[PDB]
Amino acid sequence: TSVIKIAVEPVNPSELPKMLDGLRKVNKSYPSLTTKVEESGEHVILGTGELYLDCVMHDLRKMYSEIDIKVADPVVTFCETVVETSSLKCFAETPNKKNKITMIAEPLEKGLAEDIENEVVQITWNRKKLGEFFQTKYDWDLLAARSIWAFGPDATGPNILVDDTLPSEVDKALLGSVKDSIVQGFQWGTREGPLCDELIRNVKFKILDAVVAQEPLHRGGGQIIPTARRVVYSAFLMATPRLMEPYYFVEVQAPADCVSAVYTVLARRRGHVTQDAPIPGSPLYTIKAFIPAIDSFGFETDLRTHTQGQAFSLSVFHHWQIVPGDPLDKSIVIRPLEPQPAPHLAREFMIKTRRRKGLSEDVSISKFFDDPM
Amino acid sequence: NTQELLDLLVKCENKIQTRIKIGLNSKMPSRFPPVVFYTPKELGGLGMLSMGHVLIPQSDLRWSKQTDVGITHFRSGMSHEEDQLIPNLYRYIQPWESEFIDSQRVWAEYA
Amino acid sequence: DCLIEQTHPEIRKRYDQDLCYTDILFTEQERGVGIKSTPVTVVLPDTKG
Amino acid sequence: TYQRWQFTLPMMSTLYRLANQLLTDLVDDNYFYLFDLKAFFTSKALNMAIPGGPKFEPLVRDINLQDEDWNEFNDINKIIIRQPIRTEYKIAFPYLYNNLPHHVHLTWYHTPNVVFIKTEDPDLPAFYFDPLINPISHRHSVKSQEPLPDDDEEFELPEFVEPFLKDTPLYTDNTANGIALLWAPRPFNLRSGRTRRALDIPLVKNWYREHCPAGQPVKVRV
Amino acid sequence: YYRFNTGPVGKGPGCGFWAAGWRVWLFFMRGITPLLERWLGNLLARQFEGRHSKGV
Amino acid sequence: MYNGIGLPTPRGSGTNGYVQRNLSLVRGRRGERP
RNA sequence: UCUGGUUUCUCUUCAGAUCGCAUAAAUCUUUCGCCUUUUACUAAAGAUUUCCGUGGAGAGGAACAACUCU
RNA sequence: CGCCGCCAAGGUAU
Ligand SMILES: O=P(O)(O)O[C@H]1[C@H](OP(=O)(O)O)[C@H](OP(=O)(O)O)[C@H](OP(=O)(O)O)[C@@H](OP(=O)(O)O)[C@H]1OP(=O)(O)O
Ligand SMILES: [Mg+2]
């Protein structure tokens, strides 16, 4: 997953379509690059690695658009989840004042989340076959296993839906189950992020109950997608959600003479060293560890710097992990500089992304998520 | 508080040092020491007041134009570091607010 | 490069620096890691030949 | 006129043994990370320095200028900082950590890290500085062709049933110094070459282009 | 001089590795020989055939 | 330059350089040697 | 059985190769820093030469040229 | 993380 993400800007704001054409030529020349433009006007580029983005910016600056270019400080694309189940049930409203869809949300297991991320189950299967697979894998209820519908982001991400927690027949007249409107609303509403404009993962949403209008051709049948949007991530953000940072799995080859330096540069950067393996052949041997991607900035450079040239490291994208802190923490004072070793760094990590293109702060459940009448 | 004037005093003080050095055609730190300068006229010499030996401050240059960061990374002043500790003039001049707070109570007790 | 020097009977084989001229870009001859490939169409004989 | 020379390997091994106490044990160009000529060109052009490296004068690109609203919308106390961006990150590659580059050179990355176990004892396959995790004397986990020693002598001609060589072993007295001289520095890995001059040849050349040894004064490092 | 003193060797003089200063003061005369060659040729011209007051 | 700063013109001003470190700072963890 | 040549000393132009596994000075045009005017200067870029050496090529000899590659 | 090291013409007339 291309996870590092830098903002890009021209020095002169006048000659903007020339760097647009150069950036498009880079995107043609570099396939794993993904460029985006947002409501705040600045262009952003997410790529795979540091030397990859190095060669990208080299060919962007001095071959395809020969203008001076300012960049921002690097940051990674981070994700969102919930860790416990819901403690309160949501509420719905529409401009027809007709529907009332109440629902909740609860987490999953990370192995089957990686399995559905790695195209193990597919939407082209039969209903009962993948129902029986999910049945024998996640010891689920039989009546609610086969009653699922289309999956989350690109029908692949672990954001599944289960309709049959609270009993199966309510109306079932015309729509009666999530078929076209709510499914496409979740397709169009899972990439644009709920909390701080970042995606969700490892959370499934289950409807408690719902009701359809008397005539969806006359009343709201296409006027319930932002309602479904608001109710889904209102029920998500009321369950005390958390953020997820990526780790890099790192493999280091190093001699035994300068060995403690990689341990000191991982323990300073919160490294959980897993495997110290003496390999046959070369006296240099391997260290397999986990490091945060936000602390991966110049990892191999400083690693070769402390080991005076003897060691070498490689980084790769690992799956998501839980950050030290919660986004909904209030009455807390965050210093602008002086990065925190403290266990409440996620509040800083989300206010410094809502000071970005973002939204407006004070995300408590008062205005857009619930109606305290 | 003004760092750019503390740099200017260090720049001009060593410049008049060098101007007196080229009058002797010496320009040497070891042959022509600063002991020649920092001695009073009553015992003999020229008699001058040190502001280069104040250990002028610096800051993070990336965030110096951005935000008041505090105090970090002291910079040396003059090229004299043999631990003689030539004092600064301002530590023997009474400040503004001390003079005003003393003046109010002095005139109050005088009345 | 070894198989293309088998192919080409016109060589400037390495004496001082390496002859990795398949890494063609200027940002991959100086790093020495390779950023952009370029595939080569050749012939190879077998033990029949 | 004393132009071109060709030596032999024991004679040059004696030269390599007599040329110690001023020659480095460095074999590859991996100790020179941020000590390369191109990294020093980058440090010259980018108004920065390596701790232990040179400090040049800047060039034509002294003063940058961006007005208040544009770099305000670009940079406030807004970026997610975890560790400060050091100057070694920019001297490594000045393209995503630093803006507006010119007169810049681009350095080397990851020569394949030769380790070169030295020898002080005969019997060249010494098997030292080398662990081994393979369980010896018993392993089978994959199928193999011909599990049946049944074929009798039919096609191996006895005039050349033997291997290629038995007239000499794979090691003798002057092969350890040869493979030690294979990974030797530049004046010793040749066996043949040209004649230089007494002002041409540098002697203090691999000393200063290193790291600074600890426990030394400030005048030796300047 | 700080690579003689490593180990039990001694602080006193004996620093007799002279090739390095020798090479750079050969590099001096290597570039200064045509310069003051031309200067002494101009000196011999100014001394032996006289000066040019209002020529060039 | 250890991290960010130094002096580009030591020959212009009447100084030699050598920015020190502020020993009067207060934070939790700063050492690397012990 | 025929084919039959390495060094050293003198001219002869071409050099595009870390011409040299290293690297001196000067001139001009600009930016600086000491500076009173200047030569002596500081140290960065741009472009020219000078200079200590080197590379391959045409000849005339001599040095064991007859040992012998072919 | 540690600048900097100085000669002369300018005056005892031609
Ligand atoms: O005074 P230091 O800064 O410590 O350096 C001195 C100095 O060398 P430098 O002044 O050039 O740096 C001496 O040379 P002098 O200038 O005093 O003549 C030299 O002696 P040599 O002339 O033999 O090179 C030797 O001093 P010493 O006499 O003790 O050998 C040396 O270093 P150390 O003083 O640290 O030994
Ligand atoms: Mg005059």
PDB file of N, CA and C in Angstrom, chain A residues 158-223:
ATOM      1  N   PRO A 158     -12.418  -4.579   4.881  1.00  0.00           N
ATOM      2  CA  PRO A 158     -13.222  -5.143   5.975  1.00  0.00           C
ATOM      3  C   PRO A 158     -14.142  -4.126   6.634  1.00  0.00           C
ATOM      4  N   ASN A 159     -15.226  -3.795   5.942  1.00  0.00           N
ATOM      5  CA  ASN A 159     -16.278  -2.923   6.451  1.00  0.00           C
ATOM      6  C   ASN A 159     -17.632  -3.555   6.150  1.00  0.00           C
ATOM      7  N   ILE A 160     -17.768  -4.833   6.524  1.00  0.00           N
ATOM      8  CA  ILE A 160     -18.904  -5.648   6.101  1.00  0.00           C
ATOM      9  C   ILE A 160     -20.171  -5.233   6.847  1.00  0.00           C
ATOM     10  N   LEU A 161     -21.304  -5.741   6.369  1.00  0.00           N
ATOM     11  CA  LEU A 161     -22.604  -5.435   6.944  1.00  0.00           C
ATOM     12  C   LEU A 161     -23.376  -6.720   7.221  1.00  0.00           C
ATOM     13  N   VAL A 162     -24.070  -6.744   8.359  1.00  0.00           N
ATOM     14  CA  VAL A 162     -24.953  -7.845   8.740  1.00  0.00           C
ATOM     15  C   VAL A 162     -26.309  -7.255   9.100  1.00  0.00           C
ATOM     16  N   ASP A 163     -27.367  -7.747   8.453  1.00  0.00           N
ATOM     17  CA  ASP A 163     -28.696  -7.166   8.609  1.00  0.00           C
ATOM     18  C   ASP A 163     -29.560  -7.875   9.643  1.00  0.00           C
ATOM     19  N   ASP A 164     -29.205  -9.091  10.048  1.00  0.00           N
ATOM     20  CA  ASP A 164     -30.135  -9.983  10.733  1.00  0.00           C
ATOM     21  C   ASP A 164     -29.704 -10.258  12.176  1.00  0.00           C
ATOM     22  N   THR A 165     -29.331  -9.206  12.907  1.00  0.00           N
ATOM     23  CA  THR A 165     -29.080  -9.356  14.338  1.00  0.00           C
ATOM     24  C   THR A 165     -30.387  -9.311  15.124  1.00  0.00           C
ATOM     25  N   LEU A 166     -31.296  -8.437  14.722  1.00  0.00           N
ATOM     26  CA  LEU A 166     -32.610  -8.254  15.315  1.00  0.00           C
ATOM     27  C   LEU A 166     -33.605  -8.573  14.210  1.00  0.00           C
ATOM     28  N   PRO A 167     -34.693  -9.314  14.522  1.00  0.00           N
ATOM     29  CA  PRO A 167     -35.199 -10.366  13.610  1.00  0.00           C
ATOM     30  C   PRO A 167     -35.573  -9.940  12.194  1.00  0.00           C
ATOM     31  N   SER A 168     -35.582 -10.943  11.307  1.00  0.00           N
ATOM     32  CA  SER A 168     -35.346 -10.732   9.881  1.00  0.00           C
ATOM     33  C   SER A 168     -36.499 -10.012   9.190  1.00  0.00           C
ATOM     34  N   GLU A 169     -37.733 -10.256   9.618  1.00  0.00           N
ATOM     35  CA  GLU A 169     -38.893  -9.670   8.959  1.00  0.00           C
ATOM     36  C   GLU A 169     -39.334  -8.415   9.705  1.00  0.00           C
ATOM     37  N   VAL A 170     -39.339  -7.285   8.997  1.00  0.00           N
ATOM     38  CA  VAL A 170     -39.929  -6.057   9.517  1.00  0.00           C
ATOM     39  C   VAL A 170     -40.970  -5.555   8.524  1.00  0.00           C
ATOM     40  N   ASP A 171     -40.519  -5.154   7.332  1.00  0.00           N
ATOM     41  CA  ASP A 171     -41.428  -4.723   6.272  1.00  0.00           C
ATOM     42  C   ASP A 171     -41.293  -5.594   5.029  1.00  0.00           C
ATOM     43  N   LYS A 172     -40.102  -5.652   4.418  1.00  0.00           N
ATOM     44  CA  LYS A 172     -39.771  -6.391   3.195  1.00  0.00           C
ATOM     45  C   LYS A 172     -40.761  -6.223   2.042  1.00  0.00           C
ATOM     46  N   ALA A 173     -41.339  -5.031   1.885  1.00  0.00           N
ATOM     47  CA  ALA A 173     -42.342  -4.832   0.836  1.00  0.00           C
ATOM     48  C   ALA A 173     -41.692  -4.525  -0.510  1.00  0.00           C
ATOM     49  N   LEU A 174     -40.986  -3.397  -0.602  1.00  0.00           N
ATOM     50  CA  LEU A 174     -40.344  -2.991  -1.847  1.00  0.00           C
ATOM     51  C   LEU A 174     -38.827  -3.025  -1.728  1.00  0.00           C
ATOM     52  N   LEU A 175     -38.255  -2.350  -0.731  1.00  0.00           N
ATOM     53  CA  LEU A 175     -36.814  -2.372  -0.507  1.00  0.00           C
ATOM     54  C   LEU A 175     -36.440  -3.357   0.598  1.00  0.00           C
ATOM     55  N   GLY A 176     -36.876  -3.093   1.831  1.00  0.00           N
ATOM     56  CA  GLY A 176     -36.825  -4.041   2.937  1.00  0.00           C
ATOM     57  C   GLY A 176     -35.483  -4.562   3.430  1.00  0.00           C
ATOM     58  N   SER A 177     -34.397  -4.209   2.746  1.00  0.00           N
ATOM     59  CA  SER A 177     -33.035  -4.660   3.005  1.00  0.00           C
ATOM     60  C   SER A 177     -32.115  -3.801   2.153  1.00  0.00           C
ATOM     61  N   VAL A 178     -30.850  -3.734   2.556  1.00  0.00           N
ATOM     62  CA  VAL A 178     -29.903  -2.829   1.912  1.00  0.00           C
ATOM     63  C   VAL A 178     -29.489  -3.419   0.557  1.00  0.00           C
ATOM     64  N   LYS A 179     -30.059  -2.874  -0.520  1.00  0.00           N
ATOM     65  CA  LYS A 179     -29.836  -3.421  -1.854  1.00  0.00           C
ATOM     66  C   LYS A 179     -29.105  -2.455  -2.777  1.00  0.00           C
ATOM     67  N   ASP A 180     -29.656  -1.267  -3.026  1.00  0.00           N
ATOM     68  CA  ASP A 180     -29.093  -0.350  -4.012  1.00  0.00           C
ATOM     69  C   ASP A 180     -28.737   1.004  -3.420  1.00  0.00           C
ATOM     70  N   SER A 181     -29.644   1.618  -2.659  1.00  0.00           N
ATOM     71  CA  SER A 181     -29.436   2.991  -2.208  1.00  0.00           C
ATOM     72  C   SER A 181     -28.397   3.057  -1.097  1.00  0.00           C
ATOM     73  N   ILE A 182     -28.559   2.221  -0.072  1.00  0.00           N
ATOM     74  CA  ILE A 182     -27.678   2.285   1.088  1.00  0.00           C
ATOM     75  C   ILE A 182     -26.317   1.690   0.751  1.00  0.00           C
ATOM     76  N   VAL A 183     -26.289   0.691  -0.136  1.00  0.00           N
ATOM     77  CA  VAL A 183     -25.035   0.053  -0.535  1.00  0.00           C
ATOM     78  C   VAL A 183     -24.172   1.026  -1.330  1.00  0.00           C
ATOM     79  N   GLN A 184     -24.766   1.680  -2.333  1.00  0.00           N
ATOM     80  CA  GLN A 184     -24.045   2.700  -3.089  1.00  0.00           C
ATOM     81  C   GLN A 184     -23.734   3.928  -2.240  1.00  0.00           C
ATOM     82  N   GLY A 185     -24.569   4.230  -1.242  1.00  0.00           N
ATOM     83  CA  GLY A 185     -24.246   5.307  -0.319  1.00  0.00           C
ATOM     84  C   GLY A 185     -23.032   4.997   0.537  1.00  0.00           C
ATOM     85  N   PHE A 186     -22.875   3.730   0.925  1.00  0.00           N
ATOM     86  CA  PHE A 186     -21.671   3.348   1.655  1.00  0.00           C
ATOM     87  C   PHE A 186     -20.466   3.244   0.727  1.00  0.00           C
ATOM     88  N   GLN A 187     -20.685   2.917  -0.551  1.00  0.00           N
ATOM     89  CA  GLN A 187     -19.587   2.934  -1.518  1.00  0.00           C
ATOM     90  C   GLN A 187     -19.073   4.352  -1.739  1.00  0.00           C
ATOM     91  N   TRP A 188     -19.982   5.317  -1.817  1.00  0.00           N
ATOM     92  CA  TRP A 188     -19.641   6.721  -1.999  1.00  0.00           C
ATOM     93  C   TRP A 188     -19.342   7.415  -0.671  1.00  0.00           C
ATOM     94  N   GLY A 189     -19.487   6.714   0.453  1.00  0.00           N
ATOM     95  CA  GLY A 189     -19.253   7.317   1.749  1.00  0.00           C
ATOM     96  C   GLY A 189     -18.301   6.583   2.672  1.00  0.00           C
ATOM     97  N   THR A 190     -17.428   5.737   2.122  1.00  0.00           N
ATOM     98  CA  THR A 190     -16.395   5.103   2.936  1.00  0.00           C
ATOM     99  C   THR A 190     -14.990   5.579   2.593  1.00  0.00           C
ATOM    100  N   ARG A 191     -14.812   6.258   1.457  1.00  0.00           N
ATOM    101  CA  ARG A 191     -13.496   6.763   1.085  1.00  0.00           C
ATOM    102  C   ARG A 191     -13.274   8.167   1.634  1.00  0.00           C
ATOM    103  N   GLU A 192     -14.284   9.027   1.528  1.00  0.00           N
ATOM    104  CA  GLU A 192     -14.263  10.327   2.192  1.00  0.00           C
ATOM    105  C   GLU A 192     -14.426  10.088   3.686  1.00  0.00           C
ATOM    106  N   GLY A 193     -13.407  10.456   4.456  1.00  0.00           N
ATOM    107  CA  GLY A 193     -13.300  10.045   5.836  1.00  0.00           C
ATOM    108  C   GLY A 193     -14.258  10.730   6.788  1.00  0.00           C
ATOM    109  N   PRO A 194     -14.752   9.972   7.770  1.00  0.00           N
ATOM    110  CA  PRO A 194     -15.745  10.520   8.705  1.00  0.00           C
ATOM    111  C   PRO A 194     -15.199  11.478   9.754  1.00  0.00           C
ATOM    112  N   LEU A 195     -14.079  11.128  10.386  1.00  0.00           N
ATOM    113  CA  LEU A 195     -13.602  11.850  11.559  1.00  0.00           C
ATOM    114  C   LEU A 195     -12.622  12.956  11.186  1.00  0.00           C
ATOM    115  N   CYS A 196     -11.589  12.624  10.412  1.00  0.00           N
ATOM    116  CA  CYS A 196     -10.558  13.582  10.028  1.00  0.00           C
ATOM    117  C   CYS A 196     -10.134  13.395   8.575  1.00  0.00           C
ATOM    118  N   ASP A 197     -11.096  13.035   7.712  1.00  0.00           N
ATOM    119  CA  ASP A 197     -10.906  12.796   6.273  1.00  0.00           C
ATOM    120  C   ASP A 197      -9.902  11.666   6.025  1.00  0.00           C
ATOM    121  N   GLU A 198     -10.060  10.565   6.765  1.00  0.00           N
ATOM    122  CA  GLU A 198      -9.279   9.351   6.563  1.00  0.00           C
ATOM    123  C   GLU A 198     -10.198   8.139   6.656  1.00  0.00           C
ATOM    124  N   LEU A 199      -9.845   7.080   5.925  1.00  0.00           N
ATOM    125  CA  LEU A 199     -10.749   5.952   5.714  1.00  0.00           C
ATOM    126  C   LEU A 199     -10.922   5.115   6.981  1.00  0.00           C
ATOM    127  N   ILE A 200     -11.842   4.151   6.908  1.00  0.00           N
ATOM    128  CA  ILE A 200     -12.118   3.256   8.024  1.00  0.00           C
ATOM    129  C   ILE A 200     -11.776   1.825   7.626  1.00  0.00           C
ATOM    130  N   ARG A 201     -11.548   0.989   8.639  1.00  0.00           N
ATOM    131  CA  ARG A 201     -11.135  -0.398   8.476  1.00  0.00           C
ATOM    132  C   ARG A 201     -11.344  -1.105   9.809  1.00  0.00           C
ATOM    133  N   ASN A 202     -11.563  -2.428   9.750  1.00  0.00           N
ATOM    134  CA  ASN A 202     -11.675  -3.317  10.915  1.00  0.00           C
ATOM    135  C   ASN A 202     -12.876  -2.930  11.785  1.00  0.00           C
ATOM    136  N   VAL A 203     -13.973  -2.557  11.131  1.00  0.00           N
ATOM    137  CA  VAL A 203     -15.225  -2.224  11.805  1.00  0.00           C
ATOM    138  C   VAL A 203     -16.383  -2.606  10.887  1.00  0.00           C
ATOM    139  N   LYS A 204     -17.337  -3.362  11.423  1.00  0.00           N
ATOM    140  CA  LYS A 204     -18.521  -3.769  10.681  1.00  0.00           C
ATOM    141  C   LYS A 204     -19.736  -3.060  11.257  1.00  0.00           C
ATOM    142  N   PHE A 205     -20.661  -2.687  10.385  1.00  0.00           N
ATOM    143  CA  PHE A 205     -21.841  -1.935  10.779  1.00  0.00           C
ATOM    144  C   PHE A 205     -23.073  -2.807  10.573  1.00  0.00           C
ATOM    145  N   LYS A 206     -23.914  -2.888  11.601  1.00  0.00           N
ATOM    146  CA  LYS A 206     -25.083  -3.757  11.591  1.00  0.00           C
ATOM    147  C   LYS A 206     -26.315  -2.919  11.885  1.00  0.00           C
ATOM    148  N   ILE A 207     -27.345  -3.063  11.052  1.00  0.00           N
ATOM    149  CA  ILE A 207     -28.585  -2.337  11.284  1.00  0.00           C
ATOM    150  C   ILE A 207     -29.371  -3.014  12.401  1.00  0.00           C
ATOM    151  N   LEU A 208     -29.808  -2.215  13.373  1.00  0.00           N
ATOM    152  CA  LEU A 208     -30.697  -2.714  14.411  1.00  0.00           C
ATOM    153  C   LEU A 208     -32.130  -2.803  13.911  1.00  0.00           C
ATOM    154  N   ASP A 209     -32.662  -1.712  13.361  1.00  0.00           N
ATOM    155  CA  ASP A 209     -33.929  -1.741  12.635  1.00  0.00           C
ATOM    156  C   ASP A 209     -33.983  -0.557  11.681  1.00  0.00           C
ATOM    157  N   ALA A 210     -34.903  -0.635  10.723  1.00  0.00           N
ATOM    158  CA  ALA A 210     -35.080   0.411   9.721  1.00  0.00           C
ATOM    159  C   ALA A 210     -36.518   0.353   9.212  1.00  0.00           C
ATOM    160  N   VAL A 211     -36.904   1.361   8.434  1.00  0.00           N
ATOM    161  CA  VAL A 211     -38.231   1.412   7.829  1.00  0.00           C
ATOM    162  C   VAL A 211     -38.103   2.137   6.492  1.00  0.00           C
ATOM    163  N   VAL A 212     -38.878   1.687   5.509  1.00  0.00           N
ATOM    164  CA  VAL A 212     -38.868   2.270   4.174  1.00  0.00           C
ATOM    165  C   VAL A 212     -40.083   3.182   4.046  1.00  0.00           C
ATOM    166  N   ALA A 213     -40.028   4.118   3.098  1.00  0.00           N
ATOM    167  CA  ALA A 213     -41.167   4.980   2.827  1.00  0.00           C
ATOM    168  C   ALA A 213     -42.283   4.197   2.138  1.00  0.00           C
ATOM    169  N   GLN A 214     -43.458   4.826   2.060  1.00  0.00           N
ATOM    170  CA  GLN A 214     -44.615   4.159   1.468  1.00  0.00           C
ATOM    171  C   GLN A 214     -44.468   4.021  -0.044  1.00  0.00           C
ATOM    172  N   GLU A 215     -43.861   5.010  -0.700  1.00  0.00           N
ATOM    173  CA  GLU A 215     -43.571   4.936  -2.132  1.00  0.00           C
ATOM    174  C   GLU A 215     -42.200   5.551  -2.356  1.00  0.00           C
ATOM    175  N   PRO A 216     -41.172   4.724  -2.574  1.00  0.00           N
ATOM    176  CA  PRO A 216     -39.824   5.268  -2.820  1.00  0.00           C
ATOM    177  C   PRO A 216     -39.689   6.022  -4.136  1.00  0.00           C
ATOM    178  N   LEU A 217     -40.588   5.800  -5.099  1.00  0.00           N
ATOM    179  CA  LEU A 217     -40.576   6.602  -6.316  1.00  0.00           C
ATOM    180  C   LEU A 217     -41.148   7.992  -6.053  1.00  0.00           C
ATOM    181  N   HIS A 218     -42.099   8.095  -5.124  1.00  0.00           N
ATOM    182  CA  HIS A 218     -42.700   9.371  -4.757  1.00  0.00           C
ATOM    183  C   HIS A 218     -41.967  10.025  -3.589  1.00  0.00           C
ATOM    184  N   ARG A 219     -41.817   9.302  -2.483  1.00  0.00           N
ATOM    185  CA  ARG A 219     -41.132   9.810  -1.302  1.00  0.00           C
ATOM    186  C   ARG A 219     -39.632   9.538  -1.438  1.00  0.00           C
ATOM    187  N   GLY A 220     -38.884   9.697  -0.348  1.00  0.00           N
ATOM    188  CA  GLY A 220     -37.440   9.562  -0.381  1.00  0.00           C
ATOM    189  C   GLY A 220     -36.921   8.165  -0.650  1.00  0.00           C
ATOM    190  N   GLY A 221     -36.397   7.963  -1.856  1.00  0.00           N
ATOM    191  CA  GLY A 221     -35.699   6.745  -2.209  1.00  0.00           C
ATOM    192  C   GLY A 221     -34.288   7.074  -2.644  1.00  0.00           C
ATOM    193  N   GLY A 222     -34.096   8.311  -3.094  1.00  0.00           N
ATOM    194  CA  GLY A 222     -32.779   8.821  -3.414  1.00  0.00           C
ATOM    195  C   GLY A 222     -32.384   9.935  -2.469  1.00  0.00           C
ATOM    196  N   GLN A 223     -33.258  10.232  -1.508  1.00  0.00           N
ATOM    197  CA  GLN A 223     -33.003  11.241  -0.489  1.00  0.00           C
ATOM    198  C   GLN A 223     -32.625  10.629   0.854  1.00  0.00           C
TER     199      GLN A 223
END
